[PDB]
Amino acid sequence: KSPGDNIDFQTTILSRFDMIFIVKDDHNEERDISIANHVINIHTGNANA
């Protein structure tokens, strides 16, 4: 479906912004592993230091 259909308002509102960022959640083994490692590292306290 078109990005205009995905939103829930008049499509002319999108004409007002300067930059648009449609971020998608694609599934990937290595990216999931990397993000999980990052998050548990943050929670443990290493990324704090």
Binding site: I33, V39, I40, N48
Partner: protein
């Protein structure tokens, strides 16, 4: 005189003020205090004054039973004219303290007397004109309260002709005192009280209302006004039944009698003693806490102690415990906030006892606040600026979310909130802070609280054939801020019916007139654990957690379900932190990780449609 006081000269008030009999009864009371002893032979009053001096107190409690048994005549005269004898017995107590302790007047210039165990007990509707200026004992509920005000005790005056400051003159708490003669000037001109050289005391007014249970059918409760002086202020907050001992007297000052109409008077009660009709601990309790913690299987020991008045619903009770204990908040360089409060949602069919779990949580938490989207409640959900009906002052009040900072906010009938309540809830859950711009005030308030909510599905019954998002009137932004979603279905089964029915019928038949940790210790355990335990993680479970997360992601995407997102990993870590806190340990074990994994995976699977649900049951059978 010597116990000849049974002879009556004239009215009792006149008799009790003669200097000779005054001295007689003063010595008699001093002998009572110095000599009284029970069978055990210990100096009960001696110990009372000893501890009084040790603690640097201001008042002595006295038993009416002992005094009556010893000195019936004094007891009777106290019951008749207590106003006079309170003064002399205060002096007796002061001299006793001086005898035991030196230079007590250095710190405290007064020692009040509190009576106790008065035989007759009245209700606010029984007082009449034969009780005036006498001793009474009543009971009721506290309905409204004032602040603490300063009242004059030792007034000092300024002479306007010469700057002399006339010495202290006692204020008797009967009528304002004045002066008319200056020793220096020999004058009589204007005077003004000196505020910087005067000593004051504490004053407070309280309204007592009868307990509704005791009112015979067909009538309405009565009420009175009470006066609390010195260290009786801020002892009985609104909403608790109390027993008050005091002197029943008219408002003799009134305003004036030129008022037209029948000459009627108002009355008050001046309180002498007040009593009530915890989460602290000590070394004795701390050792027992640590001993109980060391035992294996303490988590299931705790879970069985949640809501004893309900049968089954083990998942609900474990989730309740998890959200009632809580995780640990984090902040990386003070620029990335992670919350530590675990939120739960109850979505069940009618007659599933959700309100009972909420009531239990309210009665068991240290700081729990009750709100609701429909009905009467002591507080709303939005902050506002509003008048005070008694002080006539503007005030800034937050909602139940602000009021329960570092606590738990309970919301009943979560499906019936209006736009304002929904906005407030969303802001509190998303930012943990509430803003306001009203009546010239712009500020932000902290809203770091835990939320436990109950709702109902559309139509009153659960449609298991559709996803949970289509069973409730709520929206994704709000629904995605919960950690544990609990779905209750009233599926018809027999054995469950016998178990629940026997529970209910037995409960009813016990209440006809004619393993688990004790609750009182559990409260202190919870307070101490939240106060003193901040468990920590180890980097050796990262591989396990990452593998489990990858498996969950892959299966969820394969089966076309609601997406599994990193929020579930964070919820798992929070629940593991809470499980570790349950044990008083300082580190996150692997068993806690397993329990958190089970909880979150089961919550996620139970909230899908039948086909997807049954597909996901096989895949995640490891847990």
């Amino acid at each position: 005189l010597e116990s000849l006081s049974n002879v009556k000269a004239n009215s009792y008030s006149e008799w009790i003020t003669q200097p000779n009999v005054s001295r007689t009864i003063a010595r008699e009371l001093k002998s009572f205090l110095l000599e009284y002893t029970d069978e055990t032979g210990r100096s009960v009053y001696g110990a009372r004054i000893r501890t009084l001096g040790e603690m640097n107190s201001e008042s002595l409690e006295v038993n009416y039973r002992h005094l009556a048994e010893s000195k019936a005549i004094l007891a009777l005269f106290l019951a008749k004219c207590p106003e006079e004898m309170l003064k002399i017995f205060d002096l007796v107590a002061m001299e006793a303290t001086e005898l035991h302790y030196p230079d007590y007047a250095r710190i405290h210039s007064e020692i009040h007397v509190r009576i106790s165990d008065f035989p007759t007990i009245y209700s606010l509707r029984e007082l009449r004109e034969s009780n005036l200026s006498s001793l009474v004992r009543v009971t009721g509920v506290v309905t409204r309260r004032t602040g603490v005000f300063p009242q004059l005790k030792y007034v000092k005056f300024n002479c306007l002709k010469c700057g002399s400051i006339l010495g202290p003159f006692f204020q008797d708490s009967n009528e304002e005192i004045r002066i008319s003669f200056c020793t220096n000037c020999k004058s009589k001109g204007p005077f003004r009280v000196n505020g910087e050289k005067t000593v004051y005391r504490n004053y407070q007014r309280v309204t007592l209302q009868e307990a509704p249970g005791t009112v015979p059918p067909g009538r309405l409760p009565r009420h009175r006004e009470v006066i609390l002086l010195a260290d009786l202020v801020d002892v009985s907050k609104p909403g608790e039944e109390v027993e008050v001992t005091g002197i029943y007297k008219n408002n003799y000052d009134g305003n004036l009698n030129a008022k037209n109409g029948f000459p009627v008077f108002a009355t008050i009660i001046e309180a002498n003693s007040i009593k009530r009709r915890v989460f602290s601990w000590t070394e004795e309790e701390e050792r027992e806490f640590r001993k109980i913690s060391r035992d294996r299987g303490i988590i299931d020991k705790i879970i069985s102690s949640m809501a004893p008045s309900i049968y089954g619903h083990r998942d609900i009770k474990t989730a309740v415990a998890c959200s009632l204990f809580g995780g640990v908040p984090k902040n990386v360089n003070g620029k990335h906030s992670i919350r530590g409060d675990i939120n739960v949602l109850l979505l069940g069919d009618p007659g599933t006892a959700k309100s009972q779990i909420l009531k239990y949580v309210e009665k068991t938490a240290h700081r729990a606040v009750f709100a609701t989207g429909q009905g009467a409640s002591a507080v709303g959900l939005t902050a506002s600026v509003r008048k005070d009906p008694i002080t006539k002052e503007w005030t800034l009040e937050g909602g139940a979310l602000v009021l329960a900072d570092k606590g738990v906010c309970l919301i009943d009938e979560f499906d019936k909130m209006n736009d304002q309540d929904r906005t407030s809830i969303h802001e509190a859950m998303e930012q943990q802070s509430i803003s306001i711009s009203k009546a010239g005030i712009v500020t932000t308030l902290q809203a770091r609280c835990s939320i436990i909510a109950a709702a109902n599905p559309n139509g009153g019954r659960y449609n298991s054939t559709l996803p949970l998002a289509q069973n409730v009137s709520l929206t994704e932004p709000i629904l995605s801020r919960f950690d544990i979603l609990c779905v209750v279905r009233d599926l018809v089964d027999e054995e469950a019916d016998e178990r629940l029915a026997t529970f209910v019928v037995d409960s009813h038949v016990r209440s006809h007139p004619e393993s688990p940790i004790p609750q009182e210790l559990l409260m202190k355990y919870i307070h101490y654990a939240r106060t003193k335990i901040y468990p920590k993680l180890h980097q050796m479970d990262m591989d396990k957690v990452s593998r489990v997360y990858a498996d969950l992601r892959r299966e969820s995407i394969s089966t076309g379900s609601f997406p599994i997102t990193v929020r579930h990993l964070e919820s798992i870590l929070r629940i593991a932190e809470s499980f570790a806190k349950m044990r008083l340990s300082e580190f996150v074990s692997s068993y806690d990780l397993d329990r958190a994994i089970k909880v979150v995976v089961d919550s996620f699977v139970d909230a899908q449609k039948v086909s997807v649900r049954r597909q996901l049951r096989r895949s995640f059978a490891i847990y």
